[PDB]
Design an enzyme around this catalytic site. Structure first.
Site, PDB file in Angstrom:
ATOM      1  CB  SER A 152      -0.867  -0.058   1.007  1.00  0.00           C
ATOM      2  OG  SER A 152      -2.223   1.025   1.021  1.00  0.00           O
ATOM      3  CG  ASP A 248      -6.468  -1.971  -4.085  1.00  0.00           C
ATOM      4  OD1 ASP A 248      -7.000  -0.905  -3.314  1.00  0.00           O
ATOM      5  OD2 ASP A 248      -5.466  -2.434  -3.537  1.00  0.00           O
ATOM      6  CG  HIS A 278      -5.921  -1.957  -0.215  1.00  0.00           C
ATOM      7  ND1 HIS A 278      -4.706  -1.674  -0.889  1.00  0.00           N
ATOM      8  CD2 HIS A 278      -5.630  -1.523   0.976  1.00  0.00           C
ATOM      9  CE1 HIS A 278      -3.892  -0.982  -0.525  1.00  0.00           C
ATOM     10  NE2 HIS A 278      -4.372  -0.898   0.589  1.00  0.00           N
TER      11      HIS A 278
END
Lengths: 308, 314
Positions: A152, A248, A278
């Site tokens: 991320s 995501d 995600h």
């Protein structure tokens, strides 16, 4: 009656792959309970304080079982949108990567926004990489077989560090493992519409909040190591793994960064994980399918970090 | 399609805080995110080796953020039916108890059955307490503020250690934290019939298996430090917390031990957690309701391990 959360947990435990033992002897039952109850096994975990010019950073070194005497090292940067996340939130993720790659992993607690806005977190990540190279023998690792990785915003930071290391003639890198990275701040992509409503954990509003705190009043065009997608020249960067997730909102910008890297001549292994959201690298306890993708990234690390 | 395991995790997530991004409140969203699906933060964690007469044991010391400069110490014994469990299976539980108590926790990897049958695991746990007192300065803790605790067979071992410490004039203990403890091998109690079928994580047959490995050839009537519910005189033991679980087959023997402690004049906080199963202290990530009970036990610890008076005007 049964606590509803306990009920959900028992149901979830029921949908997990059966352990397949023929008989209930102690070794079998120990193994089943270890798999259920403990984080992924490594040989050694060491809490390290990194003293840099002007600041100390907490770090954690993971050395897996079966590792070389002087193993290769991935310096890892946790996710959390540049604002949240700790060594503890990503401890399981780092153990999993170390275990499957056979590489040491050094997880860095870089300083967080808004207390420390851009460019402070990326400079921390970069300086920690340099520190690891210069203190490799002390760590017990091979500083000439070095990678960066992150998930991320951590993948954002890993990407930025790979660029900083190129640009600054920094430590040579054999790989950059980018796990559903943040790469840009264009919230109009199809990914954001399809996946950003909040129903898949990470939302578009979340990302606006994160970007806001990270950049503060610095315009994104004057923060070139933030939206790394917008960097014109990606040539000469470390060979990359870019794993995105189907559901995501960051999916499209991650795919785009992988395409731009490959276009610039950087060797890239890029794939979007079907059915995943995600954060799924950190969800391997509830989502056994995550291990397939952890192994894919780990196997690329293992390949590119081998002794020459 | 959306991964089915992922969908189940999302449903689980759909029953908890929804982040408010209309408020730039970093320290809040932090405290929330950083404490869900993650072991509780502590200031120091150290793996140490304990050398006893005839064997070395692994242990792990946890020192929480706001502990005293010379913190009180709970010596902790993991569960696992005397046969299974490690420092790593119970690391999350120890972190939670350290964090919510403000006390150091020293988790002990005692030797396991059937390789080491009764009474060896209990002697390991007792000798580890004696070692911790003797080596308090080396650990950096206050040897005069000591407790024991454990879950399941670990709570069993904690109860045995409390009895052994009383009987042998061993280290003074200020508390014993007994978390759904094993206390007897009477599988006819009502909670076994109600809860022991296998649908609630621990089964009656599971307990028979554990008991078999622990005792081996020794009859339970000759193992009073295992079946602690059969100890005649419980007076003068460390003040206790006994938390049982509604859907645990061990519920009734835990309740019974608490009742006997109280009857012997030992101060006891005893309660059965509604809706809970065996093992629920370790399930706080998926079951945030566990935290109420973790906090209660840890709070009782904090109370009885309290620091002495110190004036603050310097």
């Amino acid at each position: 009656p049964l606590n509803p959360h306990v009920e959900a947990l028992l149901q979830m435990m029921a949908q997990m792959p059966a352990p397949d033992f023929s008989v209930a002897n102690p070794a079998e039952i120990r193994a089943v309970f270890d798999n259920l109850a403990a984080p992924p096994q490594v040989a050694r975990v060491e809490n390290i304080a990194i003293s840099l010019d002007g600041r100390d950073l907490d770090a954690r070194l993971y050395v897996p079982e079966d590792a070389d005497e002087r193993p290769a090292l991935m310096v890892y940067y946790h996710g959390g949108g540049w604002v949240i996340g700790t060594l503890d939130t990503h401890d399981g993720t780092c153990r999993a990567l170390a275990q499957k790659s056979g590489c040491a992993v050094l997880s860095i607690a870089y300083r967080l926004a808004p207390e420390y806005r851009y460019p402070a977190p990326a400079e921390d990540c970069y300086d920690a990489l340099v520190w690891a190279k210069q203190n490799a023998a002390t760590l017990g690792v091979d500083g000439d077989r070095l990678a960066v990785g992150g998930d991320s915003a951590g993948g954002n930071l890993a990407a930025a560090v790979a660029i900083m290391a190129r640009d600054r003639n920094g430590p040579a890198l054999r790989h950059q493992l980018l796990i559903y990275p943040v790469t840009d701040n264009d919230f109009t992509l199809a990914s954001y519409a399809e996946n950003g409503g909040g129903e898949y954990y990470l939302s578009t509003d979340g990302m606006r909040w994160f970007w806001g705190h990270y950049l503060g009043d610095t315009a994104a065009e004057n923060a070139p190591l933030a939206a790394v997608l917008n960097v014109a020249d990606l040539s000469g960067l470390a060979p990359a793994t870019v794993i995105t997730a189907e559901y995501d909102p960051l999916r499209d910008e991650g795919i785009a960064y992988a395409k731009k890297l490959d276009a610039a001549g950087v060797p890239v292994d890029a794939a979007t994980a079907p059915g995943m959201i995600h954060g799924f690298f950190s969800m391997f306890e509830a989502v056994p399918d995550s291990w397939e993708w952890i192994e894919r990234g780990a196997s690329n690390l293992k390949r590119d970090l081998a002794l020459e």
